[PDB]
Design a protein around this nucleic acid. Sequence first.
RNA 1: GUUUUAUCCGGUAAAGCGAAUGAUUAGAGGUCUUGGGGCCGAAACGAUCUCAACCUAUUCUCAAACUUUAAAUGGGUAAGAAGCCCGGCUCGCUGGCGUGGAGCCGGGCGUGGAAUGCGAGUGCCUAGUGGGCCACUUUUGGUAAGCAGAACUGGCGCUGCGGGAUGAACCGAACGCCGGGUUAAGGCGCCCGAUGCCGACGCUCAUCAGACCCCAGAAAAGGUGUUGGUUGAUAUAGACAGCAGGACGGUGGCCAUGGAAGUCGGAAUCCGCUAAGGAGUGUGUAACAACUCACCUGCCGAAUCAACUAGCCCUGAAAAUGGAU
RNA 2: CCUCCCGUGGAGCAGAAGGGCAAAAGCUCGCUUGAUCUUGAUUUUCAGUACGAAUACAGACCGUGAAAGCGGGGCCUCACGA
RNA 3: CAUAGCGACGUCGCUUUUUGAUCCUUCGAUGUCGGCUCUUCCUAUCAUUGUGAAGCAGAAUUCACCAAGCGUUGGAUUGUU
RNA 4: GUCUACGGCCAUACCACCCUGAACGCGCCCGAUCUCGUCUGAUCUCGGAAGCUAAGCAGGGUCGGGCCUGGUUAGUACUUGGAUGGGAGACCGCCUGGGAAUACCGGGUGCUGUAGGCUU
Lengths: 213, 159, 175, 168
Amino acid sequence: GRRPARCYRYCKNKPYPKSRFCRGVPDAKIRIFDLGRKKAKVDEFPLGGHMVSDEYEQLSSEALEAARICANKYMVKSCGRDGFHMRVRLHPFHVIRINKMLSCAGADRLQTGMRGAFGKPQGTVARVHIGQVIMSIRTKLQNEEHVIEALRRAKFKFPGRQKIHISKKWGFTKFNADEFEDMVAKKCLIPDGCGVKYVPSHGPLDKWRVLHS
Amino acid sequence: TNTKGKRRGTRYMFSRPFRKHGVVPLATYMRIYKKGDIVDIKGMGTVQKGMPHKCYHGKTGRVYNVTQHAVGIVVNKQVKGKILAKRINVRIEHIKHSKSRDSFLKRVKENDQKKKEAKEKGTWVQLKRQPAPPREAHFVRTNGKEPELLEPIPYEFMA
Amino acid sequence: KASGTLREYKVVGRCLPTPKCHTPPLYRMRIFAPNHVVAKSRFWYFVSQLKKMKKSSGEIVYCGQVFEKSPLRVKNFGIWLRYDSRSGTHNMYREYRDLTTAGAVTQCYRDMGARHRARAHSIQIMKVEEIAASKCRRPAVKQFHDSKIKFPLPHRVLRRQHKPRFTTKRPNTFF
Amino acid sequence: FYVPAEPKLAFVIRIRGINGVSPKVRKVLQLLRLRQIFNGTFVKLNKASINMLRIVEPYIAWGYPNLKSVNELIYKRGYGKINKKRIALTDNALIARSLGKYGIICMEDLIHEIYTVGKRFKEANNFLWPFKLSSPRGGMKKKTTHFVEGGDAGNREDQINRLIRRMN
RNA sequence: GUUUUAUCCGGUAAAGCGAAUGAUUAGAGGUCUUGGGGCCGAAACGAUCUCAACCUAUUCUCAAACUUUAAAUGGGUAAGAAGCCCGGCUCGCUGGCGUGGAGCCGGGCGUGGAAUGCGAGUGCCUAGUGGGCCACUUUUGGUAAGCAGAACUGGCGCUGCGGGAUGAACCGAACGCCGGGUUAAGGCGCCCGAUGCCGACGCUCAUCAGACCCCAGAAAAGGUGUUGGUUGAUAUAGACAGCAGGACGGUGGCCAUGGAAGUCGGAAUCCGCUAAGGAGUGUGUAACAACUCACCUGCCGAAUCAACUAGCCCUGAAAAUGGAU
RNA sequence: CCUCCCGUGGAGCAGAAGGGCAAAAGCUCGCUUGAUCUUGAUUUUCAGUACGAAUACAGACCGUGAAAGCGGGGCCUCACGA
RNA sequence: CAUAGCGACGUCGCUUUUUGAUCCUUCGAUGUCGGCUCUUCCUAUCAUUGUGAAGCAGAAUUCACCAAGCGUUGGAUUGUU
RNA sequence: GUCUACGGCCAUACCACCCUGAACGCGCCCGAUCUCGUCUGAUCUCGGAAGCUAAGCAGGGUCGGGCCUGGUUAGUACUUGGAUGGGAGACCGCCUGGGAAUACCGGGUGCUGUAGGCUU
Ligand SMILES: [Mg+2]
Ligand SMILES: [Mg+2]
Ligand SMILES: [Mg+2]
Ligand SMILES: [Mg+2]
Ligand SMILES: [Mg+2]
Ligand SMILES: [Mg+2]
Ligand SMILES: [Mg+2]
Ligand SMILES: [Mg+2]
Ligand SMILES: [Mg+2]
Ligand SMILES: [Mg+2]
Ligand SMILES: [Mg+2]
Ligand SMILES: [Mg+2]
Ligand SMILES: [Mg+2]
Ligand SMILES: [Mg+2]
Ligand SMILES: [Mg+2]
Ligand SMILES: [Mg+2]
Ligand SMILES: [Mg+2]
Ligand SMILES: [Mg+2]
Ligand SMILES: [Mg+2]
Ligand SMILES: [Mg+2]
Ligand SMILES: [Mg+2]
Ligand SMILES: [Mg+2]
Ligand SMILES: [Mg+2]
Ligand SMILES: [Mg+2]
Ligand SMILES: [Mg+2]
Ligand SMILES: [Mg+2]
């Protein structure tokens, strides 16, 4: 009962979040955004590969769910269930509406046509810009081709054009891979979970002397 | 379909700036407004009495009448294809002096001083301010340094 | 930016002096342009991209044509450029054979238009360099590195097809 | 490096017609006295005039005339605004009776005041009726785009002299 | 219906959420509790293992009816003679005061106090109209609409002319009747004025080629067609491709079993022979067996391979009278 | 219920929402009736017509406070009729 | 055993033989359903001609290509389509 | 060099903790007959001057938080005007001018008016 995605491909309206004004929104198709070994430490998965949209368009929650499932299945098949971590970087926050018409052989049956045409919430989509990351996969450095293939397969679930880019950052952090090692060595970075905490050279000296100890 | 309320659309216009709520500083009350001087109408929202209408916020007028707490201002308002000089009573919280007028009177006084001084000392001097002239000819020394060669950088996708 | 037969311009500019630096640095670029007006415009475009300069905030202290120092010698030119395609930006290294640097760059503009439908506003020429014949990488350029080069002109098409327009003899293409 | 003085005189030629003109462009063209296509006017260059030229940039081609261009324009197409009438400058008395109080009494004085922007440039320039130039012989490149992108609009630095030679 | 110089006004675009208000992803570190509980703790959970909630520092993603910050464009005012500066007078207002404020009366100051352009001010009477529509851009509803509704400017209506074959709105340009010259937009094989240039450089072969704003038809996805380009790899210590061999022992490795012996499945990837061999990329045998691959070697004697990328072309690509760069 | 500490308002101000507000505009007390009698001017819609609402004054008579002052209804934006 | 034959989650199209949406033409009128009769056209091919593929042994069947030359019927019920 | 009374701007002034404070002062402090308020002389009001700088207060400190001001972000995002520019579109590039904001990295941590004291 869902319309084709070509009817909601473009970012034509203003953002329409589920709020205290827009009520009765059905739940989004995608509820899980992180898959694989999410508890893996930062140094475990040094390689990061992003999938980046080249179009300013709307991606539906069902499309995000399908792409996530496809990428997960290929990554589990190739690199094993604990050899990767995936993060979907798009959340379907924009509600798309439908002005429902009666699909019967009658316009006299209170169809009203375009009168009071403001629609009911049909679904949720995510707005993506040119250069915005849709999915990210971090894994071992030797699984680069597997990451590229998984993202290539996931591309087929989306309307527009997407590029696969192997980032220079270390894992899901915002720091370059070449500088990551010596930054951790000189304790500008402290690992925790899947991320690193940047430790600037300002603040109380008690925080400095709990380090170097 | 728009309402005709007196304060429709003034949600941010009459709101206070960030971290500037509370007591109105008293120099605003201590300002002196004579008849004929030029004031800017702003319209702070802490004081709800004597508030100007939203169409006069940001406008500038001339004081014609002074009362205990407010002033009477002749301010131009454009209505369709005509401009008419409205007279509004505005409490002194919502107005301030016009530095454009202040600078102009300073310039007039300084020009009169220059006229008197130059008539005393004979030599003619320029008083009409000119627009920015074209740049005159000048020499640019290299100081024995070759100017740096610039080239466009190669493209790479960053993020 | 349109074209013609391009010319090389050495364009030197700087910022206007301000009460932060009395002697701002001078910057020099090589601009391949139809004329000096376009050369100055492209100089401002490029220095605005690279440094934080504007035409209004700065001035151009020199703009002079760079004559080729050996226009009587055939030489190999490598050109590093970048351009915007219909779906992205790419860096290219191309090679040409010519007498003049400006002629080589004009060849590059025509060739980019022919092979990639790239208009001159999409193309950023970032380096032009004369290269040795042993450092060339394009076979279409390397095949002319023969001290005993020899080829005929096989099928010479008649170009004077309307003088005469009507004749008794059919043209010959072998010469 | 010797940086020459920024030019203080410009020649402005209106290159687009009078159909479908936005009100601001229309007003600035009227203030420049370019109410017809292929009308030319000398403009004293400063911040205000340059910003006006930027406003009417798509509708004009302007540049820095040289002494020869000023001579050709004044001698071949020079008309005075005498008693609100367009009178051909066939005699020096016509210039002297209108501008002699400013010291301008001949074609040469008028040309000097126009070329070297003098004290009475405003009076000397407003005395001249705007030049009614012919169509550019040999055609234009593209009137709808800027000069630096292969067209004709905007500021061409000193190619305005070539344009003038083909224009009158 | 303009700029410049001063001077205010604003909360859109953008940006932000390790800043408030809402929405929201995932880990990490802590220690209290009507969190579950927890395997040997009832015995003082003798203990401390996990999951909760909570807190802390981080982390992903957002807002027309959120916001610290915050443009461009924009709106107001000022740029003098009705001004400036000296004196003096009046007041029932104000008041320590010869105070303040306002008004009035004389006098002196012209470098006419930015640019540019233009001649202004003012009154009476007054018709027609009060169905609009279109285009760039901004924009609301709608799947969309040659749909419905707004903002700005221009146009059509009210308007002919050159070009778009044709066309209310596109592009150029607006019009008295003519001669000459030159252009715009657009064109110059023939219709049809003009390339009947010894035009320049390339790309492309279509058994549905392609051919110019609006505009009058197409997408995802493909191609070992061809042309450029990026990154990487192999190679006289002999690449690549062909032709010819070895492709093992433990081990017909363990848990799966009714055969699964390398290949119906779950884990791990050992060693040595070395020229290499995966205790296996596939075919298959009920199962054996017999083949193939990746791995090496022999013949061969000079360059080769792979993955991407984007130009033209091709596939994708089906409608009704016979037909439309 | 009583006590201490933190508490930029995350409460309250009749109601919808927005703005505003801390020895406040909130809460509790005390005294009161400026929610009174009048003339004009002005703002908002606007045709610069009316109504409604509102702002600044001026003249009385008062309330409150030690006083400066504040008050002619409700903190402001609605709550109405030739 | 993914792809002989199918195709979930997604996603890109085409068509105007459905029904909608709109209200541009027609209200000084374009005769409004179905059937009968008759001609022509389309192909997204049911059959027939020539082929390719199969989980095509034969027979039957299924998928696909060139392809609209030729054919696609007699009746009960219902005004019916 | 500071303080007190009244302030102007209203964090460069706030917040947390620590150290120092000479002399005036400001305070803490003592008491409830009168004035005046309380459940309570705690607060308020009143009358004082034994003690104390413990606190307020002032100055300083903290690789302090905040705040203020710079750099970077970045001529990036966005944007006025233009084209018979590209692209099926979505959108993008160029010309002509204007031009931000986080994160990150620096610096600073009240100035001052009137009146009156103290400080050899
Ligand atoms: Mg459908
Ligand atoms: Mg919409
Ligand atoms: Mg036009
Ligand atoms: Mg000619
Ligand atoms: Mg145009
Ligand atoms: Mg708003
Ligand atoms: Mg936004
Ligand atoms: Mg937030
Ligand atoms: Mg419409
Ligand atoms: Mg009509
Ligand atoms: Mg008209
Ligand atoms: Mg017309
Ligand atoms: Mg025509
Ligand atoms: Mg046509
Ligand atoms: Mg003619
Ligand atoms: Mg033609
Ligand atoms: Mg002809
Ligand atoms: Mg095609
Ligand atoms: Mg009264
Ligand atoms: Mg009130
Ligand atoms: Mg299966
Ligand atoms: Mg009839
Ligand atoms: Mg008929
Ligand atoms: Mg067919
Ligand atoms: Mg700090
Ligand atoms: Mg720009």
